[model samples]
Target: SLKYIIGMDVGTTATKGVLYDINGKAVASVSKGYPLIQTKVGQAEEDPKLIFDAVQEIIFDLTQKIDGKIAAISWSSQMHSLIGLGSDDELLTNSITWADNCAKSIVQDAKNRGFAQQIYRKTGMPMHPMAPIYKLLWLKNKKTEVFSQAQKWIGIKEYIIFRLTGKLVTDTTMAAGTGILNLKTLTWDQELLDILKIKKEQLPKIAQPTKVIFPIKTEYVKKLGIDSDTKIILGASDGYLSTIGVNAIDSDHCALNVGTSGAIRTIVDQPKIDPSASYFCYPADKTHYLLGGPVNNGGIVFNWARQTLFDADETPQDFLDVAQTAPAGSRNLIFLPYLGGERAPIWDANARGSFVGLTRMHQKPEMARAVIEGIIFNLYDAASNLIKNTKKPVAINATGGFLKSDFVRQLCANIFNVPIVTMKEQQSGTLAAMFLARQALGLNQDLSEIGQFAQADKVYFPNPKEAATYQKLFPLYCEIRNALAASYGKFS
Candidate 1:
C-alpha cells in the first residue's frame, strides 16, 4: 500500500522536495539552491536548465531517503515566469522571472496607450513588468527574432512538466498569473493573444490542480525506483498553495509571507480586482481566488542593510538584537525599501531605495530598526490596499524566514496593528503541495485540515504604544513614496 506522498516546491531561490505521510507529517526533505542571473541593470533571470537540474536533484535525494511506496507527487511553483521554447522542446531563451524589470518601459508605454487597465480588468493581473503580459510586449519589440522564432511560450512549471511527462499543460492557478489567461472564462484570451501577436497554439492547455498524469517516463520510474502507477498531480502556484498550507482558506484570516520578498494574501469566494489595480487576484483553485499585493523588498532588503550598514563580523541574529535596541519609528528615520524596485501600490520598476530623515545622530542600531520597520511597512501598505476590496483581516498568519526573530514578529504585529500568528512548518509551500496531492489521491477532502501539519508556534499581539508610533510614521512613508514617484521619471 502506498503510505507516502512527495511534494515539490520550485521557489525563486531554491527547489524543495518534501516527503509527507498521509496525515501530513513530513518524513524526509531536501532542498537545492540556484542562482539568480542579472545580466544588466533592471534585469533578473535564471537559467532554466539550472532550475530543472535542481528540481531533479532534490527529487532524487528525497526519493532515495524514503523507504515507502510514494503515492503521488505534486508541485507548488513560482508564478509569472516566461520561457520561450523551440519546436524541438529546446529552450530558446533564459527564463525571465517575476522580478525581471526589462519590461518597465514597455509597461509604461502600454499604460500610456490606454491598454493597461483593459488588460488588467480582463486578466485580473496588474500592468507590471512582473506579469508575462509586459514581458511579451518587451520581447515583441526588443528581441523580435527570438520572439518570432519560438515555437511555444510557457512558464517554468509547464516546461518542467513537459520535460517530465512529455506533456505540456498548466494548472489554472499558474495560468491566472499570466496576463493572457481570462479570469472569467479560464481560457486564453483571444483579444490578449491578438494584442501580443501570439497564437493560442503557442500556450499550453490549462487544467485543474487536481489533474494527475501517470507514467512519468519509464526511465524516471526506474531511476527513482517508484511505482509506475505513482501519479503526478498538477498543483497550484506557490502563493495559492502557501495560503492552503497555512490554513488561510477562509475570508477572515489573511496570510502574510516575508521571505526574499513579501506578500499579504487572503482567500475570497468571488474574484475582484482592486479599482486602482494595487493588488492582484489570482486563482487559488476552482472555487477560490487570492487577493493580495506582492512587495519586491522583504528579507532581501533586510540582508542588504545588514551587509551594507553593519559590521562584517555581525551575525544575522546579532543584527536583530541591534534592531531591538532602537525603539519603534527608528528615531524618526523612514526608509523606502525598494532596493529591487517597488511593487504593489506603486508598480514602478525604476523606483529606487532611500532613507529619508537621516542624520548624524543615527547609528547602526537605529538604521537596522528603520530597515526592519521599513520592510514591515511595505507589507502593511500592500495589506492596506488589499483590505479596500475585502474585509479587514481580524488576525494574520505569518510565515517565512522573517519570523526567526521574536522582535520581527512583534514589529509585524505593531506595524500592521493586528495579531500575528506563526507556525511550525517553515516549508509551507511544500506542505501545501502535499495537501493538493493528498486531495488528488482521494485521501483528504477538507482543505482546512491541512493546517494540522502546522502547529501554532507563537502569537504576537500588537503593542499599543508601538502601534501608535508606527501609525504616526506611516504617513511619512506614504509621502516619501509619492515624492519618489513624482521624480522617478526625470531622474531615470
Candidate 2:
C-alpha cells in the first residue's frame, strides 16, 4: 500500500506538520508553537531545542494516531536562520531567526569591501544583516567567546536532520540562500569563506533534494513512532517547495503565495540572477531554480489591522463586510506592510510600515483595504520584475489562509492584472515536502512528474474595470511609496 508521507515546515512563528496518504489525501495535521524572542532594539531568536521538541511532539502524536501507516518524512524550512551547536551536539546559542538584525556592521563591511555585487550576482541573495553571513560575522565580533567554542553552524533544516539521523547535510536550496554558495558550480564558495573568515567545514554538505541522506535508526524511529528503516529526504527550501506544491514549475506557471508573508516566484530550468532588483535563487528539486522576492507581510498585515483597529476577536467575515464597502484604491491611501521591517524590494530593517495618502476622509475600513492592496501592489512589483527576466506569460497560482477572504484575493487579481488559480492544498509547503519525500522513495520523479498532484480549486480572473482602475492607481501607489521611502527609518 505505499501508506503515507509526512511533511513538516519550521516557520518563523510556528512549526507545522502534515501527513498524507498515497493518493495525496491529507490524513491529519499538527502544529506546536514557540515564542520568537524579541529584543528592545533589533534582534529575534528561537530555541532550537524548543523547535525540535515541537516537531518531535507533533510527529509522535500524529504517528500514534495513525499507527504505523506513516511511510517517510521530509521538511521545508525558513532559510538563512543561524543555529549554533557545541562539539558535543549541545545547543550553544539561541537559533537566530532570519529577521534578526544584529549584523548591520557585518553587512556594511561586506558592502564596503566591494564584494556585495559579486555575491548578489552569484547567489541572487542580498547582502542584508538578516542573511546568515552577517550573523556569523556578528558572532565573530560580538560573541567571540561563544564563536570560538562553536562546533557547527547550520540552518534550521540541517539542525533538525542532525537530530533525526546524526548526519548534517544541506540541500542546494538552503545553501543558495546563505549568500555563500556558488550558483554556477552549485557548491560552497571558498573565496567568500576566506573573505568572511569562515571555513567550509563549519557548514553542511550540499546534497540533492530527494537524496536519501540516511535511514531512520531504531531509537529515533521509536521516538518518531515510525518504521526504523523509513527514509529521510532532503526537501527543498520553503520558498521553492511552496511553488512546487502549486505546480508552478514552468516559466508561465509562476506562483503567488500570500500567507503571513507573501512571495512571487517563477521556477526556471537553470539558476539565474538579477542585480538591480531583489531576488532569491534557491534550488528546486534537482535541476530547477526558484527565483523571486519573499515579502515580509501579507496575511499578517490584515490580521494586525483586524486586531489593532477593530477588535481582538473580530470575525473575518465582519472585517470583509467592512472591506467590501470601501471603494477601490482605499480612496488614494497606501500601506507599506513592513510592520517588523521589510525584507524585499529594499531590504531595509530600518524601514517601518507606513500609511500614506491618508486624509480626514479615510476611515478604518478604508485603511484596512489599503493595507491589503498595498501588499498586493508590492507583490505586483516583484512579479512584474520576474516576468521581465523570464520572458514568460506571467500567470500565477495563489493559495493560503488569506484566500478565504475574497476581498484580498480579488484585490490581488485586479491589481496584478493576472489570473490567480487556487489549488486543493492550502498547506502547500507541507505538500511540496511530501512530494520531495515521494520522489526520494521513487514514487514520483520530478516537478512535472508530480505535476497534476493538487486539484484545481478555483480560477480568479481579473475584472476588466477593476484592472483598469488599479492600473491607474498602481503608479500612484508606487509614487507615494517612493516619496516616503526616505522617511521609513525616521518613523521606526
Candidate 3:
C-alpha cells in the first residue's frame, strides 16, 4: 500500500516538488529556480535544458527523504508555452512562453481572413499571436527547415511529463488553453489544423486528468528512492487547477488568480458564448468548463517595478505603503496593464503598458497607486465579461505572489467588490497536482472526495467605503480605455 504521494510543479520561473501523506497533508516541499529571457517586444524565452536540470535537481532532492515510502507523482504547470523540437528530440529553439508576441503578422493575417472570430466561436479562445496556432505559423513562415524537421510541438507541462515517465501526453485543461482545442468536441479542431496546414500527428495526444500514467524509469527511480512501479498522474493547467485549489468547484464560487499573469474563472457545465465579452471558455477537466480571461501581465509587473524603477535593496513594500497613502481613484488617473501586450479584450499585440492622465501634480506615489488601480480595473473588465456569459454573480478566491502583499490584497478586494479568500496553501500549484494524483491512482472512493480536504489560508473582505469609490471610478476607466484604443492603431 502507498504511504505518501509526490507532486511536481513547473512554473514560469521555477520548479518545485512536494511530498504529501495519505490524509491530504503536506510533509516536505522543495523548490529551485532556472533562467529566463525577456526582450523589449515581449519576447519571453528559456533554455529547455536549464528547466530539465532544475526538475531533476528538485525531484532528486525531495525523493531522497521519507524512508522510501512514496507512492505516486503528478504535475501542474504554466500553460500556452510552446516548446519546439526537431528530430530525435533535439532542441530546435528556446521555449516561447505565453508572453511572447513575435507573431504580429500572423495575428493580422488571421483577423484579416475573418477566421479569428470564427475560430473563437468554435473553440471559445480569441486567437492572439501568443497562441500556439499563430506562433506555429510564424515558425513555418520564418524557419521552414526547423518547421519541417519538427517532430513534435509540446507545452511545458507535456515536456516535463515526457522527462519523468517517458510518455508524451497532454491533459484536456492544458490542451484547452492552447487555442487549439475544440471546446464543443473536447478534441483538437481539424479545421484549425487544416487552416494552418499542420499535420495532426505532430501534436501530443490529449489525455484526461485522471488517467493512470506510466511509471518512471529504473534509473530515475533509483535517484528518487521510490518504487519503479509507482504510477504517475497527469494534472491540469495551473489556471484551471487553481479553481480546484480554492475549492471553487460549485457554481456560486469563482477563482481570481494573479501569478505571472492574472485571470478570472467561473465554473459551468454548459456551453456558453458572449459576443461582446472577452471571456474564453476552456475545459476545467472532463465534466466542467471554466470561462476566463488572461491579462498577460500581473505579478511580473511588480517585478518590473522593483527591477526597473526601484532597483536593488529598495523594498517594494515601501513603495506600496507610499502608494497606499494616496487616496482612492489616484486623482482621476488610469493605467492599462499591458506591459506584455494583451490576450483578452482588444487582443492586440502592439498594445503597450501606459499611464494615462499623467500631469505635473502626479507624483511617484500617485503613479504607483495608479498602476495598482489600473491592473485592478483590467481584472474587473475580465470579471465583467465572465459574468456576462455565465449570467451569474461570482464569489472570488485569490492566490499567488501578488496576493502575498497586504496592500495589494486590500486593493484587489476593494476593486472587485468581493471578498478575496487566500488559499489554504501558498503552494496551490503543487497541492493541486497532489489532488490530481489522488484521483488518478484510485486511492480515493471518488474524485469529488478529495474536495473535502481543501481550505483557505486567509480571507480579505472589501471595505465598504473603498468598494463604493471603486464603483465610481470604473466608468471613467472605460472612457480611458476607448480613448487610448485610437492611438494604438499607429503602434499596430
Candidate 4:
C-alpha cells in the first residue's frame, strides 16, 4: 500500500496544499489565493476566517485523493503575523502580517530606548515593524478594545492548526518571531512580556515543530475523509522550513532564496551574537537556530527595472539578455533596490530605491544590469553579517523565480564569491512541510545526506575576475549606502 503526505503552505497571499507521495512527487496540488486587505497603506492584513476556510477547502480537496493512505498533514507557514483570539476562539481582528509597517515608530522607539537588543538577545528576533511584539504593542495602544477582549495571541499557523485539530499551540520556529519566547529556555520571557503586559496565558503554548501531534477534529475529519489515526504534525514557519527545503542545515551550507523578496539563512546549534546584531537567530526544528537577515529587495527589483527603465513588452529573459550586455560592474553605476523601504542589515524603513553614478554613456543595459546587481548585493550584505560571525558557508543552496535567469545564477556566484546550487522546484515550502510530515511519521529522509551533495541540476562557480570586481566594488557600495542612509527619512 502507498502512503501520501499533505504539505500545506499557508502564505501571505495564498493557501496552497500539495499532495505528495512517498518518493516526493507532487501528485496533485491546489492553491487558493486570497486578499491581503491593505485597509490603508503600510498595513497588510488578512481576514483570518477567510484564510482558515481556504485551508479547510484545500484539506478536503487533498484528502479526497488520498483515502486511508493519508499519513500526516503538516504545515509550512509565513511568520510574524499577529492575531488575537477571544473567548470561545473568536478572532478579534485580522491577521497583521509581515508586510505591515504600522509599528514603524514602535520599532524606532525600541531601538532608541535600548530595549531592542534586550528583546533580540532573549527572543532572537531583531527589532522590525513586522515583528509581532511591535505589532502587539501597536495593537495594545491603538486598538485597545480588541487587545482587552482577546484570550490568546497567535500567528497564522497556530490558528490553522487549531481549526484542523482543535488544539491551540505555537511551534518554536513560529514562536521565535513573536519577540516573547526565550531563545534558550524555549518559554515565554516574562521580562519581555511584563513590559507589554501580554500574559503567558494569552499566548499559545509553545511546542517543538514535531511535538504536538493531534488527531484531526471529527467535524472536519468526516468532511476531509481522514481516518481516526490521520495525525496533524506541528511543523515550522515557511522561513525556517525553506532552510530545510534546501537542506541548508549542514555546517558547511547556507540557504538563499530570491523570489519577490530575498533571504540568506544558515542553521546553528545555538544562538550567537554578531558584531552588528544585524542578523536574527531563531529556533529551528528541535535544536538548531535559524540565523539570517531577510532583505526587502530581490527579483522584484528586476521586474521594476524592466517596466520603468525598459519597454513594457520586454520579457524577463529579454531584460536579462540586455542586462548581460553590460560589463560586470555596470560601468560603475549602482542601483539601490530599496523601493519599498528595507529591513535587515540597515533596518531602514524609510530607505527608498536609487540609481547613482550614471552618465550619458550608461544606457538601458547598464542601468538594467545595475538594478539586478544591486539586488544580489543586498542579499550579499545580509550573508556577510552571518558569514563573518559564523563559519563561511562552502556552498549556497538557492531557489525562487530568480532561477528563471541563468545569468542571475552566475551573477550570484560572482557577488557571493561562492558556488550557487539551484534547487529545481517551485513550491519549496510545501515540499519542506512534506519532509516534516514524513519525519513525524517515523520516515526519515535525510536532508544532509541526500540533499547536500551538490544534487542541483547545475552548480555555478564564481568567476575569479568578476568576483574580484565585485569584491572591490562592494565596499564602495556599502560606503555609498551608509552615506545615503540619512537622506531617506528626510523626504518620507
Give the per-residue lDDT of model 1 (tens digit) for 24-63.
8898888898888986876788888898888777777777
lDDT of 1: 0.85
lDDT of 3 by residue, 1-492 (tens): 647788888877887888888878988888888777875755888877788788778777777767656777778887778977677876787878876778767778888887777777777776676578778888889988888888888888778778777787999888887788887888899998887677788888998876777777787777666787777788888777767777777567788788767777777776565684377777765468888787777877766765565567757787788778788888878888778767666566567788888888787778778887887788888887777634445457777777778888888888888788777676666777888887776666554564566676777888999899889988988888887876765875
Query: Candidate 1 or 2, higher TM-score?
Result: 1
Q: What lDDT tens digits, residue by residue, belong to model 2 across residues 1-492? A: 448888899898798988888877778889889989896567799988899899899888878767556777888898789888888877888889887879887777778887677777766677677778678878988999888878788888999888888998989888877888877788877777887677788788889877786776677788888886677888868887888788887877888887787788888878777766367776554467888887777778878887887899877777878877888888888887778667666666677678887899899879877877877888787777676744644557888777666667787789878877777777778888888888887887756866667556877788999899899998987787678778876763
Compose the digit string of candidate 4's lDDT tens values, residues 115-151: 8878887888888878899888888899899988989
On a 0 to 100 scale, what is the lDDT of residue 234 in model 1? 89
Which window of 10 residues has the lowest lDDT sum in candidate 4?
446-455
TM-score of each model, in listed order: 0.93, 0.92, 0.89, 0.96
Q: List where candidate 4 sits over 4 angstroms from the true fold.
A: 66-68, 445-455
Q: How accurate is candidate 4 locally (lDDT)?
A: 0.84
Q: Which stretches of candidate 3 lie over 4 Å from their true place?
A: 37-43, 84-94, 300-314, 353-366, 389-394, 445-451
lDDT of 3 at 175: 86
Which structure is stronger by TM-score: 1 or 4? 4
The pairs that clash in candidate 4 are none
Per-residue error (Å), model 1, residue 265: 1.5
Alpha carbon lDDT of residue 134, candidate 1?
87
